[PDB]
Amino acid sequence: HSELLVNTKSGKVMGTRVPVLSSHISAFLGIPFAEPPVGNMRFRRPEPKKPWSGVWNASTYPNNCQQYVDEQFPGFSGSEMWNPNREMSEDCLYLNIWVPSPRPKSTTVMVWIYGGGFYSGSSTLDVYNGKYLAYTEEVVLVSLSYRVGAFGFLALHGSQEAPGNVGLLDQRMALQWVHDNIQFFGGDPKTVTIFGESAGGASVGMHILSPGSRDLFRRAILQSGSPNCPWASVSVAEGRRRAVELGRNLNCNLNSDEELIHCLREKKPQELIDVEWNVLPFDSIFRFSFVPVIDGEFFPTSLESMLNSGNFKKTQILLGVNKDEGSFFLLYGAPGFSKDSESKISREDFMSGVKLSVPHANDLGLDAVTLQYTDWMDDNNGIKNRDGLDDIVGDHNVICPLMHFVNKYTKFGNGTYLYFFNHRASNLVWPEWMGVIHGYEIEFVFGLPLVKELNYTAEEEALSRRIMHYWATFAKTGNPNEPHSQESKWPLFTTKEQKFIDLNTEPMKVHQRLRVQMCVFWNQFLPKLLNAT
Amino acid sequence: HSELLVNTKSGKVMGTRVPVLSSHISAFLGIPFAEPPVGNMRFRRPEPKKPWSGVWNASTYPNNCQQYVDEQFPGFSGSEMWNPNREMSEDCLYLNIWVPSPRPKSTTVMVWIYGGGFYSGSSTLDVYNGKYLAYTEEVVLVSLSYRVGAFGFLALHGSQEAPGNVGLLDQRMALQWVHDNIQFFGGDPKTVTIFGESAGGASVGMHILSPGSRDLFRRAILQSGSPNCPWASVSVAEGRRRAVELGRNLNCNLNSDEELIHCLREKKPQELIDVEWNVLPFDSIFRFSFVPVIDGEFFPTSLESMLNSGNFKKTQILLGVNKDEGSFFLLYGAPGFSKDSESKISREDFMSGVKLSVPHANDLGLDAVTLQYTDWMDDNNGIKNRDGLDDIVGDHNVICPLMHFVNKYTKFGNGTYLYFFNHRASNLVWPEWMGVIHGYEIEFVFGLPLVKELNYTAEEEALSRRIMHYWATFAKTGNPNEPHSQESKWPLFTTKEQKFIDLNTEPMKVHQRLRVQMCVFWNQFLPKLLNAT
Numbered sequence A, B: 001h002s003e004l005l006v007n008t009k010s011g012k013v014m015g016t017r018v019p020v021l022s023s024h025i026s027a028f029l030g031i032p033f034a035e036p037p038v039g040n041m042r043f044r045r046p047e048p049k050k051p052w053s054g055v056w057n058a059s060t061y062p063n064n065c066q067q068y069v070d071e072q073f074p075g076f077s078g079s080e081m082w083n084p085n086r087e088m089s090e091d092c093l094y095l096n097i098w099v100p101s102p103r104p105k106s107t108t109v110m111v112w113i114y115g116g117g118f119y120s121g122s123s124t125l126d127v128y129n130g131k132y133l134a135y136t137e138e139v140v141l142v143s144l145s146y147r148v149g150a151f152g153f154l155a156l157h158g159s160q161e162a163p164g165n166v167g168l169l170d171q172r173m174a175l176q177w178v179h180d181n182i183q184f185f186g187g188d189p190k191t192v193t194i195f196g197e198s199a200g201g202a203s204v205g206m207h208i209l210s211p212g213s214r215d216l217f218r219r220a221i222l223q224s225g226s227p228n229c230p231w232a233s234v235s236v237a238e239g240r241r242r243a244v245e246l247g248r249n250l251n252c253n254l255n256s257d258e259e260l261i262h263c264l265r266e267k268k269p270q271e272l273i274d275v276e277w278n279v280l281p282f283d284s285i286f287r288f289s290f291v292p293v294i295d296g297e298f299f300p301t302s303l304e305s306m307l308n309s310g311n312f313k314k315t316q317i318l319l320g321v322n323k324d325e326g327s328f329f330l331l332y333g334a335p336g337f338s339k340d341s342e343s344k345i346s347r348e349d350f351m352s353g354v355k356l357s358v359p360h361a362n363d364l365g366l367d368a369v370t371l372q373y374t375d376w377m378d379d380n381n382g383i384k385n386r387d388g389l390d391d392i393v394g395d396h397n398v399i400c401p402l403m404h405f406v407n408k409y410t411k412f413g414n415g416t417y418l419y420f421f422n423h424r425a426s427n428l429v430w431p432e433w434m435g436v437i438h439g440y441e442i443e444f445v446f447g448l449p450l451v452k453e454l455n456y457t458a459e460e461e462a463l464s465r466r467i468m469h470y471w472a473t474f475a476k477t478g479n480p481n482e483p484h485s486q487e488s489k490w491p492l493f494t495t496k497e498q499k500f501i502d503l504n505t506e507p508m509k510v511h512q513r514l515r516v517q518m519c520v521f522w523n524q525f526l527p528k529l530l531n532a533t
């Protein structure tokens, strides 16, 4: 059809129409936005995609970037729904677009940036299927791809052959192409919102911060992730260490910075993936090997200064956090946590647990941390030690850093909306001790509760639409709230009162100062203590 | 009468009979136990009292030792009930005895050691009147006197003319005389219990610790005071500093340690009392100038070691703490507290408050302290900042140190009973924000609620007898509980469960781990933090 044929400045693109609920919308899958980072392009900045001729078959899904595959619970849906579902390849720099039907004139664009510790990811996962959101909200949804792991973050600072943040650029480039072409799919370029979760949420905030990205989007949404998370960046120095340490495992020639790169450039992708985790510098839960580097090019200065002087894009943002963030990481990395078990923790594994969580802390620091989360009226409670550990991981790595980002931001920002998601899906396949898990508000945002066959309750399908509207309304207004709607208002977050809201099946309530006592400890006390040592 | 004539190894003593409630008991007032520490005896160890001839008129009260007089609220009963009520004099080394009638055969003896920061005190105060306890419980009650302030604690370590702890000896000496003569008043020497409150409670524990005192008594009771309180001792060094600094204010000749003493020996007592507080080394609430010194003679080693190795008298003890300990000190020394006022505290006086309370703490330490007692969900609450400050003073100076003493003690002790007093007298004249004040369980122990004219409620008179029995039964059993009585039992404190009880007008409840979270901070964390700095 004509609906299915579009002309972009890059070339002509033929999509496909796909069913969605009762109607039918059109989708363009796997349009390339950069020259494939294969060969000796490996490790280098993305290169714009030389226009093609003839029509491109954007009817099928693209390959997924090389990465670590979670084989911890083979067959378990809970775990595999995040594993790549398409042939992996180094040629994976494509993007996907879900367009309403009929094609809009020019409407709100939403760009999804997936994330998984910067070592995994994938735009093709079924949980990230645009059709429900695109259709239910009349919106042009586009999800992009980017290089994860060593392929996108290995950083030998001085070299032009392997500077870091490279995978952060694949992002910008996709962001560039969208800006330059989304108008042909009926999307309004002056109104694109980029929203990502976890490492994606941190990436979103890193583009709000970075000069070269700043101009390419309108607003932002960060879900369980701010750019200043302890796990989201490293010095060009640490980056270099891990760069060579990787070479060292792969029997590379660590003599010349040029040779190191050559060697790493000749290894089968999966060989790099095999030793990927052997470079971490300490035993710890929630830290990844290849991550963004604070280089001075993508980031002018340390993130703290930028945050501090207002050196960032000032627009309006909507961000949030989930009830049980740390849950997922403990299960995968702490001793004592088991999937098929209640997982009560000994006061002896709780100690081991704590060490893994604050790996950069000395004794005194660890005590502080314990004195903090330990209940002493009953200090050997299996559950209390388990749940208390979940809070340590969560607060330290996701909540508290975001709260910091939120305060320093709203001091210059043009609007700040904050949610606290805490509804546990009726059909979650993970065990209860895990609660409202990390990354599990995603399925609600993308509207899966809307399909019968996934057995979601009725008030859950209600909440999904409630979320999906907040999210889309914000995206094209800079406010979640309906201009007049007879509903309760999602109040703006102020440094005065600082209200936020509960996202769940029952009637919204607004609260104040989310985890303030616990976060002053993380954001102020602990740091000052480890500093004096 | 004959009842009123007693023959002690020191000489003959003629007492007086005094009315008590419905009956009449006999009392021997102001019997000397040492040669008056006047002249150049000033500062020196006590000297045994050379036997006199003829009969001694123990019918009237003795003089009170020289000391600072609280003139803060002239006329206010609340404050003056503690001020000396008899002519002060350097000749004040006497003791008093309330004996039942008829004279017992040989019954339980109870020795009261008063206390007031080691700078004030007095055995003659009406709140320390033995008759009610002596009579209601059939017990020989004796209260002693001892040298306070510089007169009893000035310590120039090397010198024999002014070693410290001197006032601690006046105590031992009284304790000696009781042991050697109480049998003639019908008291059983093999069963004397020494009980004191505040500085008196700390003194009691210092005799449990000291070798030379150990043998002179049976059991002990400490009320709001352990011997290891931060305010109860100093190094021979600090003692010496304050010794000379005192001389310095009084224009003494700080040249020779012998001359310093001579000078101080020629000043009118009250002149020493005038500059007494100018020697403290820092602005702070709850610290006194002349206090026991850890010399190596009275105390073999640091109290911590002694506590640690079991180097102490192992008998059974009964100790306790009051609900609002810090209350009284803030009122008198912190900025923002007023007697005739509600006393809500600014987040700005609260900071000043905290500094005064932990005077030996650096920044980091102060933050720790604040991070600890501050409520951040509402961090500028007048009441919360006021009450939170009361807990800091209390925990740090009375509760937590006692809990430490209690744990290390019961690990070798032959019985440990712990109470938590929290009843606010119906007729207290102090303001409510003060709550269950420091030193206000005394009037209950000494049975004042038993006299009508003092307008105490009926359940209060009930509680006073309840206390007075616990106290006396313990004193001659080593257990508060009645051999069979159909009442709830005051459980023993174990390092396992560690139960204690509530003392108040309603039915006793037993609880566990008194202020454990707050005390681990004081007893373990804070110390380790200020240590690493």
Ligand SMILES: C=CC[N+](C)(C)c1ccc(CCC(=O)CCc2ccc([N+](C)(C)CC=C)cc2)cc1
Pocket (backbone or CB within 6 Å): A072, A082, A115, A116, A117, A120, A197, A198, A277, A286, A328, A329, A332, A333, A438, A439, A440
């Ligand atoms: C769950 C949310 C879904 N989304 C948001 C996409 C998501 C978010 C975040 C992550 C990263 C998970 C981890 O890095 C911790 C778990 C982990 C720990 C250790 C290890 N090995 C040491 C390599 C093997 C040990 C078994 C592997 C994984 C993935 C997916």
Ligand SMILES: C=CC[N+](C)(C)c1ccc(CCC(=O)CCc2ccc([N+](C)(C)CC=C)cc2)cc1
Pocket (backbone or CB within 6 Å): B072, B082, B115, B116, B117, B120, B197, B198, B277, B286, B328, B329, B332, B333, B438, B439, B440
């Ligand atoms: C109340 C309980 C009764 N008993 C147990 C007998 C008792 C217990 C404890 C004390 C000591 C009280 C103080 O040391 C703090 C109050 C204080 C602070 C500062 C000052 N100046 C600086 C010298 C003058 C300032 C105004 C004087 C007193 C007394 C009596």
Ligand SMILES: *[C@@H]1O[C@H](CO)[C@@H](O)[C@H](O)[C@H]1NC(C)=O
Pocket (backbone or CB within 6 Å): A413, A414, A415, A416
């Ligand atoms: C947001 O920006 C607009 C336009 O610059 C301004 O009128 C408004 O007051 C700002 N509001 C906030 C949230 O600061």
Ligand SMILES: *[C@@H]1O[C@H](CO)[C@@H](O)[C@H](O)[C@H]1NC(C)=O
Pocket (backbone or CB within 6 Å): A427, A453, A454, A455
């Ligand atoms: C109920 O929903 C689950 C979750 O998607 C689905 O896998 C299942 O097939 C449905 N019914 C069954 C067979 O339990």
Ligand SMILES: *[C@@H]1O[C@H](CO)[C@@H](O)[C@H](O)[C@H]1NC(C)=O
Pocket (backbone or CB within 6 Å): B413, B414, B415, B416
């Ligand atoms: C107290 O001492 C007695 C006699 O030495 C002993 O029989 C008893 O077991 C001890 N009890 C405690 C409280 O340790």
Ligand SMILES: *[C@@H]1O[C@H](CO)[C@@H](O)[C@H](O)[C@H]1NC(C)=O
Pocket (backbone or CB within 6 Å): B427, B453, B454, B455
């Ligand atoms: C009530 O008791 C108080 C407290 O001792 C006493 O001073 C007073 O005289 C009694 N009655 C009066 C006059 O208020």
Ligand SMILES: *[C@H]1O[C@H](CO)[C@@H](O)[C@H](O)[C@H]1NC(C)=O
Pocket (backbone or CB within 6 Å): A057, A059, A060
């Ligand atoms: C081209 O795309 C794929 C080839 O893999 C396939 O669906 C079909 O042959 C073409 N698409 C359509 C529907 O024209």
Ligand SMILES: *[C@H]1O[C@H](CO)[C@@H](O)[C@H](O)[C@H]1NC(C)=O
Pocket (backbone or CB within 6 Å): B057, B059, B060
């Ligand atoms: C001796 O003691 C005092 C003297 O101050 C006085 O009560 C009386 O004269 C004598 N005591 C008695 C009652 O014999």
